[PDB]
Each structure stands twice: as C-alpha cells, then as structure tokens.
C-alpha cells in the first residue's frame, strides 16, 4: 500500500477493472475507487510525468505496447516490470461482407509466420529508442561491498 | 568515480613529495663538497640513495597492478638509470648534472599525479 | 558486518535472463526439439540472434 497505482480516467482499462470478477483485481478496484490523491489521469502523458515525478510512488497501469515504447523511445527514467495482467490483441478490419477479408487474413498470417512483424517491432521499439540500450548486458547485482562505500 | 588506479595516483602524491626532498638534499651535499669529515658527507649520501630507489620501485609496481600503462612508460626509463648505479657501483661536475635532472623529472611527473588523479575522480 | 549480512539472508540470481543474453555467453549448451515448430522456426530465421 506504499505505492498508489492508478489508470486512465476514461479508457478501456477502467472499464476492465470495473467488470473484473477476480479476487486479485477486485481488491485493486476498491482501492483505486476510494483514494484522497488523484488515482485517475485524463491524459496518458500527464500520468507519465506524474510517475517520473513521484520517484517510486505512482505505478501507472497501461497497455504493453505503449509501455515499451514510452520506456525505450523516451528518456528512460522508468521501466516496465511484471507480465501482462490480461490478454488482448490488435487487428486490421474490413467492412462486413467484403471480398478483401480472405486474402488479407492470409497475408497477415504469412507476415507473422515469416518473422516480419517481430523484425518491424524490434526496429521501431528498440533500434530507434531515445536513450537507446545503454549497457545491454544487465549488470548483475554484486553482493560484495563496493569501494565507494568505504571511500 | 573510485577506481584502484585512482587510489594509486593518490598515494604517489604523498610519496613523490618525499622523493623531492631526497634530490634536494643531494644538491646540498654536492654544494658542500664543492666549497671545500669528507667520509661523513659521502656515507650519508649512500644511506639516502637506497630509499629513493626503493620508493620509485613501488611507483613502477603500483601502476602495474592499476592497469595504467600510459603512466608506467614515464617511469621505466627512470628505473633503468638505477640499474647503471647498481651494476657499476671530474665526478663533481658529472654528479651535479646527474642530480639537477632528477629534481626536474621528479617535479614534472609530480604534477601529472596532481592532474591525472582529477581526470578520474570528478569524471564519475 | 557484510559477512554477517551474507549468512543471514540469501539472494540467488539466475545465471541468465533472456535468449539474447545466452547467445553471447555461449557457456550453457541449450537444446530444442528434434522436429517440430521450434526447429522449423529456428531454421528459417531472419533475425541475427
């Protein structure tokens, strides 16, 4: 309870938590429903700077793709932790009863099978980030005492 | 930051200052013999040269473990001159010129540790 | 103090964290299925990793 977590003011996340009949998500909804500070932000960018200014006090709940882009393609002062709570999926559409659904669906599955969508994602999300990948090799937490502690 | 080479450059400033007093006392000993018992001034010179050569041996040893090989090259020729003193074991004009260069070399390299140390501490 | 903090609580970390990390160390011999989806996917792969 030390970190207050909030979501968008009017979005799909708030509607999902309002109809989530899960004990893990139910207790989270009643906590976010009654809170003295602002646990709902109208703009996703206003909630982003709120997390950067809270410094470990506001955990914003957003989608996976938007979280990975705002972490890599922006000054990386925040990071994504944990797996996805629910499961969704994007998709291109087509008017009801149109001849441009069959071949289009076959082209989407063909691109996803040939490893093309994974390449386009890794190019626009990682190969073009703002702060980049500084020290890609994750420095393991050295259990030994550092030198600066007794400097 | 705080590296092992940064700490090695800090111990040199305290130790190289003591090497400065040795080469200065050597010029005073040479000046006294030039003006003019005699064994006292020469025996005291033999007791002073041994620590001066042994202390510099640590300067070539500390930087060896500190991976600062760009500074070791500035001290290897100084240690090679000590080998000629131990291998052989007028002379007044020769020793005078062989001592003024020590004061200049031990001072120009002294300012390096005063600046190369800052090039690592504040560069965090 | 540090030796007392060591024996009190233990924090064992995994030697790896992703697939793009083990492809650079090459210290752990990793294996897959003989014939299936994983083998066919790793066969025709355009990404470098």
């Amino acid at each position: 309870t030390e970190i207050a977590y909030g979501t968008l003011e009017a979005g799909s996340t708030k509607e999902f938590f309002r109809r989530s009949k899960i004990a893990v998500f139910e207790k989270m909804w009643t906590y976010m429903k009654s809170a003295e500070p602002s646990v709902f932000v109208r703009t996703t960018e206003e909630g982003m700077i709120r997390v950067r200014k809270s410094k470990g006090k506001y955990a914003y709940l957003l989608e996976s793709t938007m979280n990975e882009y705002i972490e890599q393609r922006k000054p990386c002062d925040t990071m994504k932790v944990g797996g996805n709570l629910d499961s969704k999926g994007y998709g291109i559409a087509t008017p009801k009863g149109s001849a441009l659904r069959g071949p289009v669906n076959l082209a989407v599955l063909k691109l996803s099978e040939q490893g093309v969508l994974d390449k386009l994602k890794s190019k626009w999300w990682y190969d073009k980030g703002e702060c980049g990948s500084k020290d890609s090799g994750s420095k393991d937490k050295t259990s030994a005492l550092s030198l600066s502690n007794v400097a | 930051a705080f590296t092992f080479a940064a700490f090695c450059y800090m111990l040199t400033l305290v130790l190289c200052a003591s090497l400065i007093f040795f080469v200065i006392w050597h010029i005073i000993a040479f000046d006294e013999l030039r003006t003019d018992n005699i064994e006292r001034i020469c025996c005291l010179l033999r007791k002073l040269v041994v620590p001066e050569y042994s202390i510099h041996g640590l300067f070539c040893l500390m930087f060896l473990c500190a991976a600062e090989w760009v500074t070791l090259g500035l001290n290897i020729p100084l240690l090679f001159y000590h080998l000629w003193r131990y291998f052989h074991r007028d002379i007044l004009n020769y020793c005078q010129k062989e001592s003024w260069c020590k004061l200049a070399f031990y001072l120009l390299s002294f300012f390096y540790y005063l600046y190369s140390m800052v090039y690592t501490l504040v560069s965090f | 103090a540090n030796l007392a903090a060591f024996l009190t609580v233990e924090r064992m970390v995994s030697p790896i964290e992703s697939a793009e990390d083990l492809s650079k160390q090459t210290e752990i011999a990793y294996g897959t299925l003989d014939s299936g989806s994983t083998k066919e996917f790793f066969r025709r792969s355009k990404i470098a990793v």
Binding site: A144, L145, L147 | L11, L58, M62, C65 | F6
Partner: peptide
C-alpha cells in the same frame, strides 16, 4: 564480503603507510 578492488587497495595502503612511517622515522 569485500570486493577484489578493495583487497588490492588494502595491501598497497598497508605498504604505503609503512613506508610513510619509515620516512617519518628517518628525518629525526
């Protein structure tokens, strides 16, 4: 409990303190 960078700093600080004390006990 102590990183390898500190163990290398202790030995050279030990010898450094020793030679400094020897130099101080020499001018007298």
């Amino acid at each position: 409990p102590l990183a390898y960078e500190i163990w290398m700093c202790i030995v050279f600080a030990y010898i450094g303190v020793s030679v400094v004390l020897f130099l101080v006990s020499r001018f007298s």
